């Protein structure tokens, strides 16, 4: 078990620096902190796509609420899915536990 973190930045001055205390401040390591410089020619979507081959099984993914997960279509269900399979659980800073509660009902 780990303590993982995803980041992402959104402002142009220091949002990875800002967002890695906001992992901490939620309990993750820093040296797992799957972060993504998305301040850059395009979005770096590599956190999620490195954390879904990092997490081991029964890790807590702890994620931040600085902007937003995905935008449209289902991407933060979509690696939230993806953890569920892989018997990992994913942390959210908004409530303090994982998605209890996202199926079809």
Do not use: C
Request: no cysteine; hydrophobic share 40%.
């Amino acid at each position: 078990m780990r303590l993982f973190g995803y980041a992402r930045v959104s402002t142009s001055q220091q949002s990875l620096d800002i967002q890695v205390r906001a992992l901490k401040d939620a309990g993750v390591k820093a040296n797992r902190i799957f972060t993504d410089k998305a301040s850059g020619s395009s979005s770096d979507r590599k956190g999620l796509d490195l954390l879904r081959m990092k997490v081991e099984e029964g890790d807590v993914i702890l994620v931040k609420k600085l902007d937003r997960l995905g935008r449209d279509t289902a991407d933060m269900i979509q690696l939230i899915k993806e953890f569920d399979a892989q018997g990992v659980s994913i942390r959210f800073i908004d409530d303090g536990i994982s998605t209890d509660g996202e199926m079809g009902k």
